[PDB]
Structure 1
Amino acid sequence: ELASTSEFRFDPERTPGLRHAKNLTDESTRELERVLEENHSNHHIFTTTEDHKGVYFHNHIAHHDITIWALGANPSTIRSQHDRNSLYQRQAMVIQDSVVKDMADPAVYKRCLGREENFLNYCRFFEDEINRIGYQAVLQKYLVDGSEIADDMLCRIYMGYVHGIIHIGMALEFKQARLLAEGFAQAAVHHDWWYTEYLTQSEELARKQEEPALPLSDLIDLARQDDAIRNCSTLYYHLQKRKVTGEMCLDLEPARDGVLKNAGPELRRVAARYRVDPNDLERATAELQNAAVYLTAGAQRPPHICAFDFFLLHSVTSSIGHTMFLAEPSLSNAQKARLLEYTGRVFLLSYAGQGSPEPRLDWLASHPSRLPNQGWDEVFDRACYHEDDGHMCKLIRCMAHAEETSRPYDHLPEFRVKQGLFLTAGIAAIDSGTDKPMDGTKHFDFIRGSGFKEAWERFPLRT
């Protein structure tokens, strides 16, 4: 069903995605296919070595290029945005074809995991697997069939702030086998072991069904009520510097060193209550999308302008992929539920890491629009020109998708974000944007640590 493993092929009618601008052009589509293949062949999946900043920074070019194509970017804009973000990339790894073939021995496949030098080797392995058994059997063998290999990969798609699942979501949404292999390959080369421990232990505990299942929105609220969870982190994770040079680093990591060290049992107890009903997946999927907008767009602080949290917004951008998992006939209801469970448990981990900010939808709702007469089409067009690495446009496109998936459920209490507030959130997001949102890989327009009062000091007061 997907475009070939061996090339990117988009179409404004056949592959426009779940949410997009009105009148997508062939000219823009051809430019997008050119820049994606340049990215695949020339750039690595990580923009930094792990020791530079302490954790890997990720290559967002595939995400950014596709997103601004979907939001109606012209070919000049696609090229400009791609060229600027190319400048800080690492050089692609070498393909060794004998390793690509040897990876069919599960012992070899396992030996290569978590090693970034294998990224293109795994891309080629997953292309070969998709061609051998088809993409649907690949989702079973490498993600949901419950084998040791699929269970291992299911944790890895969340590693590195969920970029594996963002990539996989986008590969399915835009119907690209070449991008699906990239996404499995991205996940295979991560080695953030605490995701494996957290998600495996949370799933084991959930089997006991000790306390009633709750919608994600209610579990976001339960996390804040917990003394250990609400105090488990610190703004210091965003202020730590290297002793010699004073350079920013994440040598301490909020989840590994804060949340799971200080409030492991308490968070696992909350996580264990996010059990999804396999007979109610359209609503449960919409509910997870709404809960991501709730915890992210809600993370506001009077009297400051509306700002979006860089770590929390990965909840919104990852959440879209569950619309594709839902639409996939080859996945069982039980498999689709288990995917939502993992994702929502990671949203709780991420949320606790940023100080569990108390939602202020009242403050978000009163956001004054910088510009008059802004609807989604206006916001989409502005997002095309925003000069970051894609996070602003992905946030805006995935909030617009959530508004649509929430519309059937607007009257239900577990859906905290009601219909008018999604466009308000979108305006708030683009209005927070500046003329110089980045410097190389450094972001300036997003708050880090929204749940700590001191994070807000550099944000202006709403006039």
Structure 2
Amino acid sequence: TVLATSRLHIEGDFRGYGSLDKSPPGALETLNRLMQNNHDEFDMFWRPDAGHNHTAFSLLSVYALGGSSADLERAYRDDDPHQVPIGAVDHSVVASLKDPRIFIHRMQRLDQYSNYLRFFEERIEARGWKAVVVEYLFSRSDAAEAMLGQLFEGAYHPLIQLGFGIEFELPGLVAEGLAHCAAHDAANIIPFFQKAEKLAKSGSVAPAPLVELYKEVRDTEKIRLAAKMTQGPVRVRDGVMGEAQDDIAAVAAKFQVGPDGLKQAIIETTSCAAYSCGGAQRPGKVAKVDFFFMHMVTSSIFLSILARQDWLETEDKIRLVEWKGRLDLVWYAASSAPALDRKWLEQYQPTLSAGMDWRALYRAVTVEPDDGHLAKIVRSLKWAEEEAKGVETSETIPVAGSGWFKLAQMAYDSTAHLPIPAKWIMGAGYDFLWTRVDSL
């Protein structure tokens, strides 16, 4: 039977966090047609490692930046390589997923995406998306505890997809995100999250500023060297978690948010992620933004969005930000914990984006051939400027003020007019990766 939940209709004025210019007429109709095509025709996974379908991310971000029909069509065509036929649904498997032990049991299998999608669509059709999200992520059942770890998998893709669903209140997109969450292959980050949290709640770990926990990861050789350059997409599973799970778990336990600390913890995690991106530069090299640090920033807007949901307890909002901050330390370690310096973003001189404001940068991003990350990072950075309105740089907040837009300029300048593989450096701490980066 056709579910109402399967129909993605964005309607009304809402155009997204950090939006500036309204998309011109005709864009909304293009957005709905293409989001619906992507939803019905394509899987969430097009290859085993780094194979997340970005189509929904690229469309919704280009809409938020005020792109027209033609820009959304570019976004869709640019992600053609992301778009493979959606898996056949097994309807007896879908019926069985009502049992929480069969649910848990089939988790972390990529070929299950379509089964979990149909399941979550049926469940949302019956209870609505708010009820289902609390039930499957935040209710501390066994299923929900495993789904919460899964939410951060793949450098934050499930969180990002669920985040988009919640931001635009799209039931079918919330369903895609939950299904993505359930099906994502495991990087052995769940025990990192359990160990760090058990340590944090023990009463015997004093909290420290996140910026000092980045420093400790870099300065602890066993953690810094756990990841290997040529492990590529499995650095976290086979390197950071393989060699140093307990060690990084004891560091991450020091990141602890008090009951009145939610907004500052979002600003703290977002500032340190932006600081990763902008501060991991090398003398004599052009500016490049690390691909992983870029996901640490692109994911950050969705923390801000979950933080503002009426249907979610403040305890559950604080937990989300704790876990994201902690895993940002793992992604830092996975890029070989490069030396960070505030001087690079402070001193950065824009090139292609020199003299633009946010409105002109947004316009330039809407037309730029890209898989969606450029649009995602400039929007998270404009939003970060709003979230952290009035906050200045300090010992704990390393990027603020004009730094947010300066990073956006560096992401545009260092990425525009390049093929996708040349855009983002795949681990800023690995010296060899800089031999393939232009000198000054």
Please, what TM-score do these two structures have when normalized by structure 1? Answer: 0.89
Instruction: Please list the CA deviations of residues 317-356 of structure 1 after superposition, one character each: whole Å capped at 9, or x if unmatched.
Output: 1111111221112222211111111111111111001011
Deviation at 1:429, TM superposition (A): 0.7
Which secondary structure does the structure 2 equivalent of 1:300 belong to? coil
- Whether 1:448 and 2:426 are equivalent positions in the alignment is yes
What SS is found at the alignment partner of 2:218? helix
Does residue 199 of structure 1 match 2:193?
yes
Match of 1:322 among 303, 307, 311: 303
Match of 1:217 among 211, 215, 224: 211
Does 1:396 pair with 2:378? yes
Aligned to 2:45: 46
- What whole-Å deviation, never above 9, does each CA across 1:50-87 have from its counterpart, x for those lacking one? 2xxxx251110110111111112111121122023224
Whole-angstrom CA distance in 2 between matches of 1:435 and 1:411? 32
The answer to whether the Cα contact below 8 Å between 1:12 and 1:24 also exists between their aligned partners in 2 is no
Corresponding residue of 1:296: 277
- Give the 3 Å change call, closer, same or farther, for CA 323–88 of structure 1 in structure 2: closer
Q: Equivalent residue of 1:409, what SS?
A: coil
Which segment is superposed worse, 195-204 or 226-235? 226-235
Percent identity over paired residues: 28
The separation in 2 between residues aligned to 1:292 and 1:278, in whole angstroms, is 22
Deviation (angstroms), 1:193? 4.7
Match of 1:417 in 2: 399
SS of corresponding position for 1:419: coil
Deviation string, structure 1 residues 78-134 (Cα, Å, up to 9, x no partner)? 112202322452211123344333321223323332233321221122122223233
What is the one-letter code of the residue matched to 2:243? N
Cα distance between partner residues in 1 of 2:390 and 2:12: 27
Alignment partner, residue 329 of structure 2: 348
Contact 1:94 1:117 in 2 (8 A): no
Corresponding residue of 2:345? 364
Does residue 161 of structure 1 match 2:155?
yes
The answer to whether the Cα contact below 8 Å between 1:301 and 1:360 also exists between their aligned partners in 2 is no
- State whether residues 189 and 241 of structure 2, in contact with CA within 8 Å, keep that contact through their aligned partners in structure 1: no
Aligned length: 437
Please tell me whether the aligned partners of residues 123 and 182 of structure 1 are also in contact (alpha carbons under 8 angstroms).
yes
Alignment of 1:259 with 2:240, yes or no, is yes
Q: TM-score, normalised by structure 2?
A: 0.94
CA spacing shift, 1:205–1:411, aligned 2, 3 Å: same
Structure 2 counterpart of 1:171: 165
AA partner of residue 416 (structure 1): P
CA contact (8 A) 2:235 2:334 kept: yes
Q: Which moved more, 1:22-31 or 1:147-156?
A: 22-31
| Residue identity matched to 1:395 | I
Q: In structure 1, what is the Cα distance between the partners aligned to 2:416 and 2:350?
A: 15
What's 1:152 paired with? 146
Question: Unaligned stretches of 5+ in structure 2?
Answer: none
Q: After superposition, what is the alpha-carbon deviation per residue over 1:159-179, rounded to whole angstroms, capped at 9, x for unaligned?
A: 222211111111111221111
Amino acid at match of 2:129: Y
Classify 1:429/1:45 alpha carbon distance in 2 versus 1 (closer, same or farther; 3 Å). Answer: same
